[PDB]
Design a protein around this ligand. Structure first.
Ligand SMILES: NC(=O)C1=CN([C@@H]2O[C@H](COP(=O)(O)OP(=O)(O)OC[C@H]3O[C@@H](n4cnc5c(N)ncnc54)[C@H](O)[C@@H]3O)[C@@H](O)[C@H]2O)C=CC1
Ligand SMILES: Cc1cc2nc3c(=O)[nH]c(=O)nc-3n(C[C@H](O)[C@H](O)[C@H](O)COP(=O)(O)O)c2cc1C
Ligand code: SF4
Ligand code: FES
Lengths: 493, 148
């Protein structure tokens, strides 16, 4: 019987390999077919070591399989304790629009056959027929967005880069999600890598480049390996487009998620953020025009141009269009990933969809965005997801990160960890993050003591950090603090 | 013999665009850190100055200035992993090994990483290139068992 054991880090961590061992052991002890696959993650992490088995009806999923529970197999798949039935029929999966991650957890990632049979290499083979400008306008019609930030129309960027003369332009994918709760990129380049290859190839054909890069962190090694294998496998499919892409590993620096610092780090230098009189589009990598983008923004490109922009333009709100993945982590019963159209409330996503908390306790906080994001309480459950409403309601939604904290949390500790982060993660270029941070971390201690000459001090500090700091890491850092303070005053004496 | 390896590494990254980072990665992977004995040749090959190299080395965290223990333990200290009880785990582990956070040895080296992508499997760690999750105060026993 066919077996689909995940190869994702979310699985290998919980002991998926041990499960593999146990299966092989049992099969050796119990003569059977023992046909194993190594697919990615479906997106339900609360049972990630799930042993999807083939049946004429579909693929029956199993729970958080431990190696000790393996013996329960090969005897009866119906009377199994951790039996879930059709994995595709789970409400956590059914309620998902699931466009971008459509072919993630149901294929072997490094299998070109499956990818191709899964509508693979369609957009790429479609674009080359098109023109560099037609494709650009197609992408623009949707006006997709900036996914790893506030949101800038990628079409405009592509246009700007295309309308700029030089011998060699560049393209860069900034998969450096050093944020917390943000792990969608990892799932996408660990499962369904080829989509990224495809999107970059398309974008390079479109803009007018031949050389391309992808920036992976060092905290995502398995993903690195996978992407290397991908780039190495698709060489025939790449030459067709006249595109050569390479992977570049980071070196443990959050700030390198900023475009400037990123491409400074590519250049062989130290990741100090640049000021922005010139944009990277005009003068980026090696003084050349370069198109820098998030993975999610390049994962939608092929799907867009292939399935039609107008279709992508259907999903979403008035301004925010298309599907978004919501990553849900921390103290939460059903974590993982939920891809859907905007307009859904975190109320539903946190109490209805993802149940409650692992500890069974209530939720006191929900931190949208990374540590550059606010701590929305339960009272904000009437707040649908979109860049606009969340940016206006004293907050942020970037990579759609989402963690959770229960009543046993101390907001003081977290607010402190925020500045401590901004302190340990800091290029050290502008003063309001060098010093402001390591000073705020003292101020918060003073508050913990009980001083009253601190809170206003803190506010002024936060303000100057907002208005003065060069990058966001020292401009958004105040939001966690102010949020924890104005939402949860019962913890800040 | 170190010079030979270093030369090999440099030859392997010849003509590349901005090849300082890869070269350093490989140099580290080879030895375990970036020895000051190898700040110069890199510069000589790349047309840089010892200073630029040392600055790059100093900026980034993943480039060791001194070697680690036989084993290494990275332990997330980020938001999510914090939520599902990383502090207690940390405490237990640093009591076991007797080594606080950031404090290394010839035996082991406990440090922080600030994320691993295991944000649902909140309590996460990387022990000697092997990822671990759902680290409750029991699995730490097994963590230490395979790790003296
Ligand atoms: N004082 C503060 O608190 C500051 C905070 N921030 C915020 O950080 C968030 C995201 O960070 P970034 O990505 O660094 O900046 P950003 O969001 O302004 O730029 C978005 C992306 O599009 C590109 N782009 C921008 N304007 C363009 C144009 N006219 N033509 C072509 N391409 C263009 C940029 O290269 C960048 O890659 C933004 O919302 C920004 O407001 C950034 C600067 C300082
Ligand atoms: C501190 C910091 C970290 C960032 N990290 C990321 C990241 O991991 N991924 C990303 O796509 N953008 C990140 N960005 C935003 C980049 O500046 C840029 O907007 C993004 O890489 C462009 O991709 P888009 O065009 O899809 O938005 C970060 C910005 C800052 C200030
Ligand atoms: S706030 Fe200033 S010093 Fe801090 S990381 Fe950003 S640019 Fe660098
Ligand atoms: S926060 Fe520690 S796993 Fe991402």
């Amino acid at each position: 019987m066919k077996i689909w054991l995940p190869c994702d880090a979310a699985a290998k961590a919980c002991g998926a390999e041990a499960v593999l061992a146990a299966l092989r052991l049992e099969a050796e002890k119990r003569g059977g077919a023992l046909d194993i696959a190594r697919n990615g993650s479906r997106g339900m992490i609360w049972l990630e070591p799930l042993l999807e088995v083939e049946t004429p009806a579909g693929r029956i999923g199993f729970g958080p399989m431990t190696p000790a529970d393996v013996p329960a197999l090969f005897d009866a798949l119906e009377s199994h304790p951790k039996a879930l039935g059709l994995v595709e029929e789970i409400p956590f999966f059914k309620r998902q629009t699931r466009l971008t991650f459509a072919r993630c957890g149901r294929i072997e990632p490094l299998s070109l056959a499956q990818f191709a049979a899964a509508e693979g290499w369609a957009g790429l083979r479609k674009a080359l027929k098109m023109t560099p400008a037609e494709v650009v306008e197609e992408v623009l019609a949707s006006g997709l967005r900036g996914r790893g930030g506030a949101g800038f129309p990628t079409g405009i960027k592509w246009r700007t880069v295309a309308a700029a003369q030089a011998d060699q332009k560049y393209i860069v994918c900034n998969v450096d999600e050093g944020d917390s709760g943000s792990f969608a990129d990892r799932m996408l380049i660990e499962g369904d890598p080829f989509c990224l290859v495809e999107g970059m190839a398309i974008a390079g054909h479109a803009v007018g480049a031949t050389r391309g890069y992808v920036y992976i962190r060092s905290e995502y090694p398995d993903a690195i390996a996978v992407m290397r294998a991908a780039i190495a496998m698709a060489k025939p499919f790449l030459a067709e487009a006249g595109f050569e892409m390479e992977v570049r590993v980071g070196a443990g620096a959050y700030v390198c998620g900023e475009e400037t610092s990123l491409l400074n780090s590519l250049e062989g230098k130290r990741g100090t953020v640049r000021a922005k009189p010139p944009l990277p589009a005009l003068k980026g990598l090696f003084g050349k025009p370069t198109v820098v983008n998030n993975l999610l923004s390049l994962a939608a490109v092929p799907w867009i141009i292939a399935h039609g922009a107008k279709a992508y333009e259907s999903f979403g709100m008035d301004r925010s269009r298309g599907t978004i993945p919501l990553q849900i982590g921390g103290n939460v019963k059903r974590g993982g990933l939920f891809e859907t159209g905007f307009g859904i409330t975190l109320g539903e996503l946190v109490e209805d969809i993802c149940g409650g908390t692992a500890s069974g306790r209530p939720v006191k906080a929900v931190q949208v965005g990374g540590p550059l994001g606010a701590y929305h309480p339960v009272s904000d459950y009437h707040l649908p997801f979109c860049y606009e409403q969340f940016a206006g309601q004293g907050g942020l939604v970037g990579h759609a990160g989402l963690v959770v904290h229960d009543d046993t949390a101390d907001m003081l500790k977290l607010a402190r960890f925020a500045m401590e982060f901004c302190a340990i993660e800091s290029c050290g270029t502008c003063t309001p993050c060098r010093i402001g941070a390591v000073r705020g971390v003292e101020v918060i201690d003073r508050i913990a003591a009980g001083d009253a000459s601190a809170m206003p001090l803190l506010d002024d500090l936060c303000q100057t950090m907002k208005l003065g700091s060069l990058c966001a890491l020292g401009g958004f850092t105040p939001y966690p603090v102010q949020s924890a303070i104005r939402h949860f005053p019962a913890d800040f004496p | 013999t170190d010079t030979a390896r270093l030369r090999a590494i440099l030859a392997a990254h010849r003509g590349r665009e901005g090849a300082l980072l890869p070269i350093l990665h490989d140099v580290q992977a080879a030895f375990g850190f970036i020895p000051e004995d190898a700040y110069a040749p890199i510069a000589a090959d790349l047309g840089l100055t010892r200073a630029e190299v040392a600055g790059v080395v100093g900026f980034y965290h993943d480039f060791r200035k001194a070697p680690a223990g036989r084993h290494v333990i990275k332990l997330c200290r980020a938001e999510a992993c914090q939520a599902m009880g990383m502090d207690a785990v940390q405490a237990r582990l640093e009591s076991a090994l007797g080594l606080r956070l950031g404090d290394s040895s010839e035996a082991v080296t406990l440090e922080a990483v600030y994320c691993l992508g295991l944000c649902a499997c909140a309590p996460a760690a990387m022990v000697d290139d092997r990822l671990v999750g759902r680290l409750d105060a029991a699995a730490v026993a097994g963590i230490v068992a395979e790790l003296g």
